[PDB]
């Protein structure tokens, strides 16, 4: 369940290439993966590639993996540490949720920031109040850092 399931998920992701979201083994250690996310086209993060480190606890699938960002992003849900407070990895987790669902959920969060979970309440309030300034800041950050 901690190695056969991982091999099955890796084989499944190796069959159909999403061409936008990719996952790979860091060297040879099946409990540590790197995820590359393409920026959503209809989002201020358009054209910005993002990197994530995914840790598989040994109790997988009974315990969810941990994803951490590396590239900075002016987002109301991603601080400088690269943490992600995503409900799918703490509450809405079931043994059948493969790692592909996690990447798709993160992509959805990037497209549509969720103000119900203000990891950094300042940026969330700025977005709720000054939309244009928030989007300008996000695009400037994407240009400076992602590029």
């Amino acid at each position: 369940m901690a190695l056969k399931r991982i091999n099955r998920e890796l084989a499944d992701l190796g069959k159909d290439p999403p061409s936008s979201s990719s996952a790979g083994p860091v060297g040879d250690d099946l409990f540590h993966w790197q995820a590359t996310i393409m920026g959503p086209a209809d989002s201020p993060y358009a054209g910005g590639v993002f990197f994530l480190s995914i840790h598989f606890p040994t109790d997988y699938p009974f315990k969810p993996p941990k994803v951490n960002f590396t590239t900075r992003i002016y987002h109301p849900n991603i601080n400088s540490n690269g943490s992600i407070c995503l409900d799918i990895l703490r509450d809405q987790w079931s043994p059948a949720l493969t790692i592909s669902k996690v990447l798709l959920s993160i992509s959805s969060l990037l497209t549509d920031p969720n103000p119900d979970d203000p990891l950094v309440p300042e940026i969330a309030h700025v977005y709720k109040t000054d939309r244009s300034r928030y989007e300008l800041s996000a695009r400037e950050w994407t240009r400076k850092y992602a590029i």
């Binding site: 407070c85 409900d87 703490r90 509450d91 119900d116 979970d117």
Partner: protein, 75 residues
């Protein structure tokens, strides 16, 4: 008509409602029969989440429809 709602714990609750009954009416019925506030309760039916301001007929709820109870938000 009559419908059935299953909670997260698997408890089955029978509700005497109608197709034209509003979502608010069913939420009030569930609150009266259980005590949970209507806003906290969310009903999943055929991939559709019931929302205030609509009716059961809007969600194609029919005789002996099975719904699922879920929550909304957590930190």
């Amino acid at each position: 008509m009559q419908i059935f709602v299953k909670t997260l714990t698997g408890k089955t609750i029978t509700l005497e409602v109608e197709s034209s009954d509003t979502i608010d009416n069913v939420k009030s019925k569930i609150q009266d029969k259980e005590g949970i506030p209507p806003d906290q309760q969310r009903l999943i039916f055929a991939g559709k989440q019931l929302e205030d301001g609509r009716t059961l007929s809007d969600y194609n709820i029919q005789k002996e429809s099975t719904l699922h109870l879920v929550l909304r938000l957590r930190g």
